[PDB]
Amino acid sequence: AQAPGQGFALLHIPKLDVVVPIAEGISSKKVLDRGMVGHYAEDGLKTAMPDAKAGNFGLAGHRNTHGEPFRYINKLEPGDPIVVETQDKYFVYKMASILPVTSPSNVSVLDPVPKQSGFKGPGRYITLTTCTPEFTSKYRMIVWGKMVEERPRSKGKPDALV
């Protein structure tokens, strides 16, 4: 279904005024209810990290409580930047595709080449998953992006964060 606990990066979505830590795993108690977004990491759902030259970096966040980081990801439009900041790099993605409603059992949206995204082959992707409609957990909403810049921290913030 969709939805250690150690925070290892920061997710920035400038259009949504979102800055939020990413932790390993999608536990409600240890991660999402702590106001963080979670990297799918267990039960066969483990996805690639952004530093991999190909893969799908999958993340889950709350729609409606604890800082509600993904409450408005349906307001993203093609080209809107999504930035993952790590100790060593900035990974800049741009929004590419949206699946506004799907079954919580539809885990194939986290595949290396995510099903239903319209992506044709291997690339470097990000997947954001949250609940829909608001204040329920009936369905899931999925937003996908594609990497456009891998930037060493020594080069300062990417344009997207300024």
From Swiss-Prot:
Induction: Transcribed independently of the operon's upstream, overlapping gene (SCO3851); transcribed with srtE2 over the first 72 hours of growth. Part of the strE1-srtE2 operon. Disruption phenotype: A single srtE1 deletion, has a significant delay in aerial hyphae formation when grown on minimal medium, but no delay on rich medium. Nearly wild-type levels of ChpC are attached to the cell wall. A double srtE1-srtE2 knockout grown on minimal medium has a more severe delay in aerial hyphae formation and does not make spores, on rich medium initiates aerial hyphae formation later than wild-type and does not make spores. It comes from the Bacteria. The active site is at H62, C131, R140 (proton donor). It is found in: Cell membrane. Signal peptide: none annotated. The record marks Y40 as: Substrate recognition. Residues 1-162 are extracellular. Coiled coil: none annotated. Changing C131A: Inactive, does not complement a double srtE1-srtE2 knockout. Significantly reduced in vitro peptide cleavage activity. Belongs to the bacterial sortase family. Class E subfamily. The probably cytoplasmic N-terminus cannot be deleted without destabilizing the protein. Transpeptidase that anchors surface proteins to the cell wall. Recognizes both Leu-Ala-x-Thr-Gly and Leu-Pro-x-Thr-Gly, with a preference for the former. Unlike the S.aureus sortase it cleaves not only the Thr-Gly motif but also the Ala-X bond; Ala-Glu and Ala-His bonds are better substrates than the Thr-Gly motif in vitro. Among its possible substrates are the chaplins ChpA, ChpB and ChpC; this enzyme is less important for ChpC attachment than is SrtE2. This is Sortase SrtE1. It comes from Streptomyces coelicolor (strain ATCC BAA-471 / A3(2) / M145). The chain holds residues 168 to 351 of 352 of the full protein.
